[PDB]
Amino acid sequence: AFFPTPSGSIVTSESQLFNKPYWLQRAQGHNNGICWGNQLFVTVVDTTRSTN
Amino acid sequence: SNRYPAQPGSDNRECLSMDYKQTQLCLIGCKPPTGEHWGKGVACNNNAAATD
Amino acid sequence: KVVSTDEYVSRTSIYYYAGSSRLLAVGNPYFSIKSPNNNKKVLVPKVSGLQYRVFRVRLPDPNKFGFPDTSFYNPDTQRLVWACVGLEIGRGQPLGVGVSGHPYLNKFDDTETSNRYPAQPGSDNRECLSMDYKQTQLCLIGCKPPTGEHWGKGVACNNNAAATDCPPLELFNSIIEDGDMVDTGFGCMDFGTLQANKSDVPIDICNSTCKYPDYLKMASEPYGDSLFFFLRREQMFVRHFFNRAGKLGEAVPDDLYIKGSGNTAVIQSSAFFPTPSGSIVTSESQLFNKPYWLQRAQGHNNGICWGNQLFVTVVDTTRSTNMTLCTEVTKEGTYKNDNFKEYVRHVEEYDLQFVFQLCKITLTAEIMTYIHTMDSNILEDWQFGLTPPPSASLQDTYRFVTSQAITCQKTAPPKEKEDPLNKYTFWEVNLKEKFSADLDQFPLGRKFLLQSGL
């Protein structure tokens, strides 16, 4: 009954996702940027900035 | 290195630590986005004593 | 003089999405547990992250459609056949790599830092160990099931010479059945029959035949209808160094080394083996969740699906987590070790999308010879070359059947048995009931219609 331990590797600044804009040209669904109910949901997950 | 015999004891828990997996993702929607996992779903009416 | 498949067909301009349901696969990663009373009833199957998950779709007959616009499908001379023009294989589990482990592996010594003379004797030194695997990804698509070889046993020779007892060697070409294990970094051979002590590879290989897809013969097939399109990417590198334990049957010559004595009176083994280990697995170098457009296949059969079925095979080793469950039998206020029983499980999912295009095939007399010599079964199903069976009237009737005017009449001919594929196990996925035409209600045609320039 084994279990391994995951560790991951170095974290750079070239391989980041944040602090830079995006432009929604054409979304993947059908409602291309329209939001109803006057709200929308953003969720982010970050591990690289989790110093304890 | 792991040789015979085993090193027996009624408890062998340790005080360890480990790192995690590096991960980043972003997500936009006009609805709370869904997610999944494996949960304990109940059996059929009888297994007739097959396996715990 | 095989001609290509774009001279005797004629592409139409009408497109058809299809789409599978979400498939799952739950079982044990190590061994297929059987019944305590039965040897043919499985309880939990052996599914792992190291197998050739081979899909076999089944397309519906295009001639079993009824169109109102009967101006293009002229059934005097022409017939219909699909073509593949796209594909997408998705996954839905996180990126995670799994380990396998033998409990009696032949790790005799350690041969990278210190193997200090003399020997430590003892007539058993096997033990429990575990390691990572050669990580890989590939996919093949074709109208015939893929071919793959493996090294194996054979008749050695005749019985004149008596030089040294050594096993013979011969590779074997066969068909890649599902459930078989990929090569994993210990050579593309049988391990059941060519090894004996079953204690050199981990437990998921020790009764298996690690085949490998013949990229060379399947490329050089004369019709070219086993490989539409193929991708691959893999890496591995060594982790440690060990060595086996036994009488090395082939002697090491005294020429190559200075003879020694004292503490060095008994020469050691020269039978090493390394251990593979896949490095970091990213999500940048993935090979799934991306479309693939076949603008021109590599073979002659330019995407056209004879036989109304495809064979898609795919294997991944990056998504090979092992869920470990832990349960108890009693409730005790202190920690114990005899109070718990634990279990290993592995889950697996897939998804297929397709986009097909049907094209009509004219049938001259010149053409119907050419299709006849490729395979005769394809002309049988369209029912174009047939004969009248003879024998106008029989007399095989009686009003009473269970009597004494009887010859003990027998029936049930085995006539519907024609496919030679039932000796092999495929994963069947049904596509006969899920075609559609309005692309835009589906998660791929919107990624397709921008590609067409419309």
DSSP secondary structure, A6-48, as one string: -------STT---SS----SS-SSSS-S--STT--EEEEEE-T
Of B10, B38, B50, the CB nearest to C323: B38
Interface chains of chain B (3 or more CB pairs under 8 Å): A, C
Measured in whole angstroms, the distance separating CA C236 from the mean position of its chain's CA atoms is 21
- The shortest C-alpha distance from A46 to chain C (Å) reads 16
| Chain B / chain C CB contacts < 8 angstroms | 25
- Provide the 10 A C-beta neighbour count for residue C303: 23
Could you tell me which residues of chain B have a Cβ less than 8 Å from any Cβ in chain A? 18-33
Measured in whole angstroms, the distance separating CA C34 from the mean position of its chain's CA atoms is 23
Of B18, B25, B32, the CB nearest to A45: B25
> Which residues in chain A have their CB less than 8 angstroms from residue B2's CB?
none
Q: What's at C407, amino acid-wise? A: T
Burial class (CB in 10 A: 0-12, 13-18, 19+), C97: buried
Of B24, B28, B29, the CB nearest to A45: B24
> Nearest-CA neighbor of C357 among C314, C298, C295?
C295
Burial class (CB in 10 A: 0-12, 13-18, 19+), A25: exposed
> Nearest-CA neighbor of C144 among C343, C361, C378?
C378
Q: Is the dihedral of CA C90, B35, C29, A8 positive or negative?
A: positive
Closest residue of C to A15, CA-based? C284
Residue A3, CB-side half-sphere exposure with 13 Å CA sphere: 10
> Cis bond leading into C420, ω under 30°?
no
Longest C-alpha distance within chain A, in Å?
Answer: 51
CB contact under 8 A, C128 and B2: yes
- The shortest C-alpha distance from C345 to chain B (Å) reads 12
Alpha carbon distances (Å) from C216 to C2, C145, C224, C244, C435: 20, 15, 12, 34, 35
Of C96, C101, C280, the CB nearest to A2: C101
Query: Which uninterrupted H or E stretch holds C366?
Result: helix C365-374
Q: What are the beta bridge partners of residue B17?
A: none
**Token digits for C122?**
């003892």
Strand-pair category, C311-316 with C53-58: antiparallel
Alpha carbon distances (Å) from B29 to A26, A27, B37: 14, 11, 21
Residue with tokens 């009686």: C398
> Which residues in chain B have their CB less than 8 angstroms from residue A48's CB?
22, 24
First to last CA, chain A: 32
Report yes or no: C255 and C280 within 8 Å, Cβ to Cβ.
no
**Token digits for A10?**
């170095």
Of A5, A31, A46, the CB nearest to B24: A46
Of B4, B38, B52, the CB nearest to C341: B52
DSSP C313-326: EEEESSB---EEEE
Alpha carbon distances (Å) from C284 to A43, C234, C269, C280: 21, 14, 43, 11
**Token digits for C414?**
């085995």
> Nearest-CA neighbor of B13 among C316, C340, C271?
C340
> Nearest-CA neighbor of C143 among C4, C297, C6, C310?
C310
- Provide the 10 A C-beta neighbour count for residue C355: 22
Which residues is chain B interrupted after (C–N above 2.5 Å)? none
Closest residue of C to A10, CA-based? C280
Output DSSP code: residue C319: B
The span from the CA of C385 to the CA of C376, in Å, is 10
Report yes or no: C100 and C321 within 8 Å, Cβ to Cβ.
no
- The shortest C-alpha distance from B4 to chain C (Å) reads 7
- Helical ranges in chain B per DSSP H: none
Between CA B29 and CA B36, with CA B32 as vertex, the angle to 5 degrees is: 115
User: Taking the CA atoms of chain B, what radius of gyration do you get in angstroms?
Assistant: 22
Phi, psi of C127 (to 5 degrees): -160, 180
The span from the CA of C17 to the CA of C87, in Å, is 10
CB contact under 8 A, C342 and A3: no
> Which residues in chain A have their CB less than 8 angstroms from residue C130's CB?
2
Report yes or no: C291 and C89 within 8 Å, Cβ to Cβ.
no
CB contact under 8 A, B30 and A37: yes
What determination technique applies here?
cryo-EM
C322, C325, C327, C341: best to mutate for the A interface, most A CBs within 10 A: C322
The span from the CA of C396 to the CA of C411, in Å, is 12
Report yes or no: C390 and C397 within 8 Å, Cβ to Cβ.
no
User: Taking the CA atoms of chain A, what radius of gyration do you get in angstroms?
Assistant: 18
Interface chains of chain A (3 or more CB pairs under 8 Å): B, C
- The shortest C-alpha distance from C61 to chain A (Å) reads 32
CB contact under 8 A, C324 and A9: no
- The shortest C-alpha distance from A4 to chain B (Å) reads 11
Residue C308 DSSP SS3: helix
